[PDB]
Amino acid sequence: GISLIAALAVDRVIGMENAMPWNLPADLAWFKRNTLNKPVIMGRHTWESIGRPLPGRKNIILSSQPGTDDRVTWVKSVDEAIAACGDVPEIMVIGGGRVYEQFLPKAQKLYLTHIDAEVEGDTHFPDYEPDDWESVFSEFHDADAQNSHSYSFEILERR
């Protein structure tokens, strides 16, 4: 199916103009664990924030304009993005806000990191009602020497 994976500060903030004011290697490890060797769909701005392909995966970039890096696959519509993933057990949608908004109604699972941080942002994860979803996994973690804020992971499966 289609899954979304995202890291959310309070008020569902996911993005801003500058780099996020946190350091969460545990969230990166979680992202890798759940996307390894799966196709990833991302918007063009998320692509520019990474700068290079995520290894071992089909990288699919949504843009209305021709692609500018032949190392990844560029598509001009949601339907083309899904088609480019082919026949796979799980498609991972990795951001950003505009892309999450379009794929949420298609998604069966959400992988969410909730960060105990209040940050001014210009992009939010789309609204969802927790009652429409079942929490199948949850774990809370404190900040530590490597992670600047406390955070929790949850996996929600659409009811």
Ligand X SMILES: NC(=O)c1ccc[n+]([C@@H]2O[C@H](COP(=O)([O-])OP(=O)(O)OC[C@H]3O[C@@H](n4cnc5c(N)ncnc54)[C@H](OP(=O)(O)O)[C@@H]3O)[C@@H](O)[C@H]2O)c1
- Residue positions in the annotated binding site for NADP(+)? 7, 13-19, 45-46, 63-64, 76, 95-102
Burial of residue 86 (CB within 10 Å: 0-12, 13-18, 19+) is exposed
Give the separation between CA 42 and CA 152, rounded to whole angstroms. 23
Instruction: State the number of CA atoms in the 13 A half-sphere of 11 facing the CB.
Output: 9
Residue 150 interaction partner, one of Ca ion, ligand BFR, ligand X, none, beta carbon < 5-8 Å per kind: none
What single-letter DSSP state applies at residue 8? E
Size of the site for Ca ion (CB under 5 A): 1
Extract the tokens encoding 73: 């696959």
Helices marked H in 1-111: 25-35, 44-50, 78-85, 97-103
Give the separation between CA 108 and CA 85, rounded to whole angstroms. 16
One residue of 5, 7, 15, 126 binding Ca ion per CB under 5 A: 15
Task: By CB under 6 A, tell whether 68 contacts ligand X.
Answer: no
Give the separation between CA 119 and CA 9, rounded to whole angstroms. 7
Task: By CB under 6 A, tell whether 126 contacts ligand X.
Answer: no
Q: Name the minimum Å distance from CB 91 to ligand BFR.
A: 13
One residue of 3, 7, 59, 62 binding ligand BFR per CB under 6 A: 7
Binding string, residues 71-90; x marks residues near ligand X by CB under 6 A = -----xxx------------
Task: By CB under 6 A, tell whether 148 contacts ligand X.
Answer: no
Task: By CB under 5 A, tell whether 97 contacts Ca ion.
Answer: no
Site residues, ligand X (CB under 6 A): 15, 42-46, 62-65, 76-78, 95-99, 102, 123
Using CB under 5 A, list all residues that contact Ca ion.
Answer: 15
